[PDB]
A paper describes a structure:
Streptococcus pneumoniae scavenges essential zinc ions from the host during colonization and infection. This is achieved by the ATP-binding cassette transporter, AdcCB, and two solute-binding proteins (SBPs), AdcA and [name].
The binding site mutations impacted protein conformation and interaction with Zn(II) to differing extents. Taken together, these data demonstrate the importance of SBP-metal complex conformation for bacterial Zn(II) uptake.
Numbering used by the authors: 28 to 127, 133 to 255, 259 to 305
The structure:
């Protein structure tokens, strides 16, 4: 290897965690997934790049289902496909919890919990240390340093959330379910598990009733149009909250961007 293993990642959380666990060791790139990860269909060029790589890392078969149809053996490729969330426990989708198509029941937005981002980093560090065992002492040392700062960041917002008077927030899509359950909050998504799941009229009426009931002052959006109409019917305000679905394109690391989003959330819920 020149620079190292040529690793390709699914989207921004996986890219950031692989780049921080690997450190200055390997050449890590990610396919262009700015346009939605839930409604992302890869091109032939991206698939050819994945087959010409050493390691491909994706989050879960519940998010990037197109990574399951990948078959490296029949295409004479040596790429090692790694599921970064193998072994993790996925909670039920809000609104489908007592349901018993089976991929729809589990929420894949598990990288926004600071603690479950840390679990993903350990799994990547172990998996990359089965694939390139010689540099394993570094994959763990860097994985162990990220979990500590994620643990350092989770015991810091615990008290801020603990003293919040309002524990309910509404978001453009249902992505903050794990983060909300982490700090004892109650969230409601307008578009649900996927931004292409626009609400039904009855669901829209129930969302209006919910905003009026729990005195939700602001609606967190992403940088959808239906979310931009409830401001009239409810009188709420529009504040930004990035679910880190894509690259923020700045100098901060992953946990720093997560810290910024949590800080916005904590300053609003007071
Ligand atoms: Cl998302
Ligand atoms: Zn299509
Ligand atoms: Zn799987
Ligand atoms: Zn496995
Ligand atoms: Zn239940
Ligand atoms: Zn190596
Ligand atoms: Zn080395
Ligand atoms: Zn406490
Ligand atoms: Zn989402
Ligand atoms: Zn009702
Ligand atoms: Zn910090």
């Amino acid at each position: 290897p020149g620079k190292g293993m040529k690793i390709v990642t699914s989207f921004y959380p996986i890219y950031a965690m692989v780049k921080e666990v690997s450190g200055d060791l390997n050449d890590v790139r990610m396919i262009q997934s700015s346009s939605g990860i839930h409604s992302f269909e890869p091109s032939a060029n991206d698939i050819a790049a994945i087959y010409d790589a050493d390691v491909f890392v994706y989050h879960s078969h519940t998010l990037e289902s197109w990574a399951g149809s990948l078959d490296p053996n029949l295409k004479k490729s040596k790429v090692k496909v790694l599921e970064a969330s193998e072994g993790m426990t996925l909670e039920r989708v809000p609104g489908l919890e007592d349901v018993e198509d089976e991929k729809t029941l589990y929420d894949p937005h598990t990288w926004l919990d600071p603690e479950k981002a840390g679990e993903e980093a350990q799994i990547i560090a172990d998996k990359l240390s089965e694939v390139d065992s010689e540099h394993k002492e570094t994959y763990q040392k860097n994985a162990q340093a990220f979990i500590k700062k994620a643990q350092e960041l989770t015991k810091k917002f615990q008290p801020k959330f603990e003293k919040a008077t309002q524990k309910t927030f509404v978001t453009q899509h249902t992505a903050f379910s794990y983060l909300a359950k982490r700090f004892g909050l109650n969230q409601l998504g307008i578009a649900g598990i996927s931004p292409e799941q626009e609400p039904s009229p009855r669901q829209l009426t129930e969302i209006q009733e919910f905003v009026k009931t729990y005195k939700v002052k602001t609606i967190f959006t992403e940088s959808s149009k239906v979310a931009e109409t409830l401001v009239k019917s409810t009188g709420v305000g529009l504040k930004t909250l990035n679910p880190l679905q894509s690259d923020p394109q700045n100098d901060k690391t992953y946990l720093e961007n997560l810290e910024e989003n949590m800080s916005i959330l904590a300053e609003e819920l007071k």
